[PDB]
Amino acid sequence: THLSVDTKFKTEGLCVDIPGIPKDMTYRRLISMMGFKMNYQVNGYPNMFITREEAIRHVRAWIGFAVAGLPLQLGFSTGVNLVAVPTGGLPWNVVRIKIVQMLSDTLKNLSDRVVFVLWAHGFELTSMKYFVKIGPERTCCLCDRRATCFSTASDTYACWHHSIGFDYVYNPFMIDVQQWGFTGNLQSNHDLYCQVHGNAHVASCDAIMTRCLAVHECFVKRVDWTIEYPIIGDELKINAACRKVQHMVVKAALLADKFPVLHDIGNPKAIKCVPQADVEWKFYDAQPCSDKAYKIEELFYSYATHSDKFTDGVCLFWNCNVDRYPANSIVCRFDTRVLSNLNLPGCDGGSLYVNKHAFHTPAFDKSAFVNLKQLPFFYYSDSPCESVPLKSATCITRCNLGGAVCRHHANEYRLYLDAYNMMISAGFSLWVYKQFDTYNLWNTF
């Protein structure tokens, strides 16, 4: 599939300056009016514009682009504003070099392309012929990576890593948010879901608001479990570390306070992280997976609506990012403020954490944890004790009741500290019911 060049393009959003002729226009004609010869459909570039679904798959490539402005102000979701003075303030030869530099620095570790996100008034499409070249899909002249850049000086193509001195953005993709069935202007729509992006008259602020709005439409409602994103960092080691820590913590809580029920709030797949534990395991999600729905209550947790509920046992909120956690809770939450290639700027102070799936995460807020304390580091095992000795008050094992710690539990401890440290560094924090104490783990022996 791709977006057919013959698909209709609504022209209502385009400023009074830009004509229709007959107002039933297409992408074929718009691309032509932009000054681009579209001969490249056989060679993996059938359309400059892409479907919403293609855009969502390429979310890491999203750069808001708007033009304000004779001289044009070009603005990007990165905060950069460039003013281009045409021949007949800064010249186009210098602007096009800077645009390539900025996109390379932003995208090199995120994506193999750029998707320009537009609220298209006409001028920003008109500008592209000054810094964009289209042609057949190509590899970089120095890598197997797809070509994103062209150098007029040398007739050579580069990826985002190999682009120093390059002057043309090559085969960018773009999406016009105005085609998505909105009414009114950009600000009226953006401001419904976000107070954090202001309306200061520069082009970059329009670019930032457009990407924010698009992020809102495509990610804030729910997790799409059908769309997977490639590995670009330590996803595998981070996710293995988190699952190791999840098991430990929920096991330890279940032994230490002997809760008769665990409420797994935000578990849409009905998979227990401690499957062998003696407890009634209840599953709740705002969006249960259809094939598991029979044994998962559909429920959107808010303290304001459910403080009279989950009165018994312990609530597991494993990256289920609610407004306020009740007092009987074990919580993993991701800090939206951490800098990571995994973590993209999101809507309303939130971030879009793309790690296998795209998880929009509300702004990190201390007040959510008002009824909880930080979970202190500990290692717990009640497994066989078989064979620098380990001198730690946080190794909670039979061999550490008075003896030197066994080779096994000493090895496990150091793997678990490595895992916990990996998880802390990846921007996750752990919270627990205030009455939680390792005192009640030392007694299990």
Ligand SMILES: Cc1c(S(=O)(=O)N2CCc3[nH]ncc3C2)cc(C(=O)NCc2c(F)ccc3cnn(C)c23)n1C
């Ligand atoms: C990174 C990640 C998380 S996360 O929890 O770390 N996370 C990140 C930050 C964030 N912000 N907003 C939401 C979230 C969620 C969860 C998953 C995932 O695919 N989970 C699928 C799944 C279930 F749905 C239920 C039971 C299990 C057991 N194993 N897996 C794999 C299960 N990924 C890839």
Ligand SMILES: Nc1ncnc2c1ncn2[C@@H]1O[C@H](CSCC[C@H](N)C(=O)O)[C@@H](O)[C@H]1O
């Ligand atoms: N207020 C809320 N109430 C219930 N479920 C919620 C929620 N906010 C988010 N969710 C759900 O929380 C899940 C987060 S992603 C899956 C997390 C899961 N606990 C795991 O171990 O991997 C999604 O399925 C989402 O639908």
Ligand SMILES: [Cl-]
């Ligand atoms: Cl990459």
Ligand SMILES: [Cl-]
């Ligand atoms: Cl050119």
Ligand SMILES: [Cl-]
């Ligand atoms: Cl961020």
Ligand SMILES: [Zn+2]
């Ligand atoms: Zn390269």
Ligand SMILES: [Zn+2]
């Ligand atoms: Zn915003």
Ligand SMILES: [Zn+2]
């Ligand atoms: Zn031991």
